[PDB]
Amino acid sequence: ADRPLWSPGSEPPAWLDGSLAGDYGFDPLHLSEEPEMRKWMVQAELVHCRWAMLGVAGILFTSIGAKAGGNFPDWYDAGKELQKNSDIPLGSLIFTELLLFGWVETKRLYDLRNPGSQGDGSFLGITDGLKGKENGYPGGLFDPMGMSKNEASFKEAKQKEVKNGRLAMLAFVGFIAQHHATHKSPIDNLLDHVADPFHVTFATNGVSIPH
Amino acid sequence: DIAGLTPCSESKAYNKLERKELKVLDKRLKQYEPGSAPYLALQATKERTENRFKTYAKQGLLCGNDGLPHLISDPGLALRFNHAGEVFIPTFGFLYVAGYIGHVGRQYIILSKEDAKPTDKEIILDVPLALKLAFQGWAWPLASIQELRNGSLLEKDENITVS
Amino acid sequence: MKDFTTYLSTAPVVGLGWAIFTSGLLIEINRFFPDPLVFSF
Amino acid sequence: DRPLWYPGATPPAHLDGSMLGDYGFDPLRLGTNPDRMKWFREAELTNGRWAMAAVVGILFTDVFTSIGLVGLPKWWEAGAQTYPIDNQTLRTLAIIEFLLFGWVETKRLYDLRNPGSQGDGSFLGITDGLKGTENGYPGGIFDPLGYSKTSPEKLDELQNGRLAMLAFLGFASTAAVNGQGPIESLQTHLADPFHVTFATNGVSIPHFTEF
Amino acid sequence: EIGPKRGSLVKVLRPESYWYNQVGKVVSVDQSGIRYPVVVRFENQNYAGVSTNNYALDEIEEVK
Numbered sequence: 001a002d003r004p005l006w007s008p009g010s011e012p013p014a015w016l017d018g019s020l021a022g023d024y025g026f027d028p029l030h031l032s033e034e035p036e037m038r039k040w041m042v043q044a045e046l047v048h049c050r051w052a053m054l055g056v057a058g059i060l061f062t063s064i065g066a067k068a069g070g071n072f073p074d075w076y077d078a079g080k081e082l083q084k085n086s087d088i089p090l091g092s093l094i095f096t097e098l099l100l101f102g103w104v105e106t107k108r109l110y111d112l113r114n115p116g117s118q119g120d121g122s123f124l125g126i127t128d129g130l131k132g133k134e135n136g137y138p139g140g141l142f143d144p145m146g147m148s149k150n151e152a153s154f155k156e157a158k159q160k161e162v163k164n165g166r167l168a169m170l171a172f173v174g175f176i177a178q179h180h181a182t183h184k185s186p187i188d189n190l191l192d193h194v195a196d197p198f199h200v201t202f203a204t205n206g207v208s209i210p211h
Numbered sequence: 212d213i214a215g216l217t218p219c220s221e222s223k224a225y226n227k228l229e230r231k232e233l234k235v236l237d238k239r240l241k242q243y244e245p246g247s248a249p250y251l252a253l254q255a256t257k258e259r260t261e262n263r264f265k266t267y268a269k270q271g272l273l274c275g276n277d278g279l280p281h282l283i284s285d286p287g288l289a290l291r292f293n294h295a296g297e298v299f300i301p302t303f304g305f306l307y308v309a310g311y312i313g314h315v316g317r318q319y320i321i322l323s324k325e326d327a328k329p330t331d332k333e334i335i336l337d338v339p340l341a342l343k344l345a346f347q348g349w350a351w352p353l354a355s356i357q358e359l360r361n362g363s364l365l366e367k368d369e370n371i372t373v374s
Numbered sequence: 375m376k377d378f379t380t381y382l383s384t385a386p387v388v389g390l391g392w393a394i395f396t397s398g399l400l401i402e403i404n405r406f407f408p409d410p411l412v413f414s415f
Numbered sequence: 416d417r418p419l420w421y422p423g424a425t426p427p428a429h430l431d432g433s434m435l436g437d438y439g440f441d442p443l444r445l446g447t448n449p450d451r452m453k454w455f456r457e458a459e460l461t462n463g464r465w466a467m468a469a470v471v472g473i474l475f476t477d478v479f480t481s482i483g484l485v486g487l488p489k490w491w492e493a494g495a496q497t498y499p500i501d502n503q504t505l506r507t508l509a510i511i512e513f514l515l516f517g518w519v520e521t522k523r524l525y526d527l528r529n530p531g532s533q534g535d536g537s538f539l540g541i542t543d544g545l546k547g548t549e550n551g552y553p554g555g556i557f558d559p560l561g562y563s564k565t566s567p568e569k570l571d572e573l574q575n576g577r578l579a580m581l582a583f584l585g586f587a588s589t590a591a592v593n594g595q596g597p598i599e600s601l602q603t604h605l606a607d608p609f610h611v612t613f614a615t616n617g618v619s620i621p622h623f624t625e626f
Numbered sequence: 627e628i629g630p631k632r633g634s635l636v637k638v639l640r641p642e643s644y645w646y647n648q649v650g651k652v653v654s655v656d657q658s659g660i661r662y663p664v665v666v667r668f669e670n671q672n673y674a675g676v677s678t679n680n681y682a683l684d685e686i687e688e689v690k
């Protein structure tokens with residue numbers, strides 16, 4: 001009786017009311033019920049959003065470049081033809097990626113178990129920065145612009161990145177579903193639908209056609 | 212030359228057995244077209260069968276009058292030759308894994324003897340404790356020998372006997 | 375959720391999770407590595 | 416205690432006590448018992464001190480070989496060059512090694528057992544100098560360079576010994592799969608840093624990089 | 627005043643007893659006077675499923 005819910009009239013869960021950004025009381029499988037699993041899942045969803053947004057942005061920009069005339073492959077089968085004629089071998093690229101990501105994902109991990117553990121100044125004497133402002137929102141060094149030093153603006157600005165990330169990760173499932181059917185770029189599926197709405201789904205393989 | 216056995220490449224019976232197996236495979240391989248699935252399955256089977264017979268004959272493993280391989284299990288005959296892998300290192304690998312397992316299980320069952328109603332912990336395990344101990348036992352030879360010199364594994368004759 | 379995680383310490387867990395891990399590991403080792411009967415050296 | 420191995424939130428249990436090169440690294444809890452810790456300390460000392468005098472024979476001797484000043488062989492066959500030599504003290508080497516070591520290793524053993532316990536008339540007139548100040552740190556050996564107050568330079572020795580043990584482990588792992596020597600691998604890796612990498616030699620998966 | 631302090635754990639030396647050489651707390655040392663005054667209580671069951679038993683004072687001994 002204080003916030004919009006996902007199902008109008010249903011009783012919101014008793015383990016989440018208004019503290020988390022993007023809270024609508026949607027949890028039917030009783031997940032993140034304990035404080036620790038919720039502290040885990042919050043930052044898990046946050047990282048999912050922060051990767052889905054970058055992925056969808058890159059995909060859409062490369063697709064618009066390809067449709068406009070740029071030398072850009074589509075989002076699918078792009079790691080196959082960018083590796084054939086590249087100076088950096090596969091494997092030597094994968095383990096470079098994993099070596100650079102382990103060192104940062106580990107520091108991201110142990111700031112979840114004990115916040116502020118990274119701001120002791122052992123890494124290049126960085127003390128003020130590298131200190132977890134909240135569960136999954138660090139600051140100081142990752143926030144060069146003073147755009148989170150006000151709760152009135154921050155509680156309202158963080159409640160929209162979760163929505164944009166949820167929408168972006170729903171769009172990423174659209175990218176996959178929208179490829180196994182048409183085998184065309186995501187921007188191509190758009191222009192083939194605005195120019196003629198009659199070319200809507202349920203026309204190629206969405207529904208079974210034995211008759 | 213040991214035990215009257217001969218290296219397994221010079222065994223006419225071994226090659227005769229390989230040819231027999233290949234003929235038996237091909238006689239029913241010729242039943243299907245080269246495009247269907249069963250044909251590819253038989254092709255891959257023949258692939259790894261030829262691979263069986265080729266890869267064995269390296270570094271030396273003795274086959275007898277029957278042409279089949281025969282494992283040498285004596286240390287000393289696996290030495291002075293090249294047979295230390297027949298069964299000499301597998302022994303140490305199993306000893307390592309069995310140690311690992313027993314060490315972890317013992318330290319678990321000991322650390323549970325302190326809390327109230329340990330029987331419950333034997334039907335409702337402590338999954339995180341078991342996972343922790345599972346990723347700490349791969350130094351058990353070090354811990355075992357020095358825990359033996361320690362004396363924390365000998366019970367000072369305080370158990371139930373009848374005689 | 376809590377009672378479910380507690381239930382997940384019995385026969386329907388390791389003893390299933392275990393021995394499923396082990397069957398999978400052994401089958402994968404015998405699949406990628408087709409037919410071992412002696413060590414490399 | 417000097418900086419911790421994990422920068423953030425990993426509490427040590429029994430490594431709060433003072434000791435040389437202590438960064439709180441003991442994940443498997445192998446040094447809980449103080450007597451076994453006291454033994455493993457000398458273990459490190461003897462391993463590190465031995466690997467440093469070994470890697471120098473592999474590093475400082477092969478740097479001149481690559482430059483072309485000297486024609487010494489690589490270490491993975493320096494052992495095979497010896498006995499074919501004309502004046503070759505054949506392999507009565509190993510057993511005389513064992514004898515000459517044993518006689519000293521037993522003295523060090525009994526000194527660790529009864530620290531600084533050398534009889535008065537046991538060794539001709541040099542019994543006096545054989546008493547060691549501490550375990551693994553004897554007096555009579557270093558002529559200069561020990562009478563300072565800043566005796567905690569042992570940190571340098573321990574860090575260099577650990578680095579040299581890693582060096583020799585890397586030497587043995589390289590000269591086994593790369594086929595070449597350490598200096599040669601380093602030079603090829605500076606020549607082309609993206610192709611000569613452990614990913615191409617050592618791991619079985621990336622060998623299937625079929626586009 | 628006769629037997630060990632109540633709440634203090636003690637072992638058993640009855641040669642024919644399921645519980646032998648292992649420790650068990652005392653319920654109440656019978657002060658009224660009887661040949662088997664010490665009533666010891668054990669958590670683990672026996673072949674019959676009984677948890678407690680009374681023993682003589684010449685049989686029980688000190689702690690580990």
Ligand SMILES: CC(/C=C/C=C(C)/C=C/[C@@]12O[C@]1(C)C[C@@H](O)CC2(C)C)=C\C=C\C=C(C)\C=C\C=C(C)\C=C\[C@@]12O[C@]1(C)C[C@@H](O)CC2(C)C
Nearest residue numbers: 026027028029030031048051052055058075078079169172
């Ligand atoms: C689908 C998804 C989330 C779905 C979540 C669901 C259903 C959860 C449902 C519930 O839990 C709730 C909420 C509440 C619970 O009580 C009940 C249930 C019902 C359990 C997220 C996807 C999230 C997906 C993400 C973040 C994907 C990222 C993709 C990236 C980064 C792409 C990068 C590349 O595109 C480039 C740049 C170049 C290309 O060549 C290569 C690639 C790799 C394609």
Ligand SMILES: C[As](C)(=O)[O-]
Nearest residue numbers: 360450451453454
């Ligand atoms: C110093 As000790 C207990 O290993 O003999």
Ligand SMILES: C[As](C)(=O)[O-]
Nearest residue numbers: 590591592593594
């Ligand atoms: C495996 As090798 C380099 O010793 O032949």
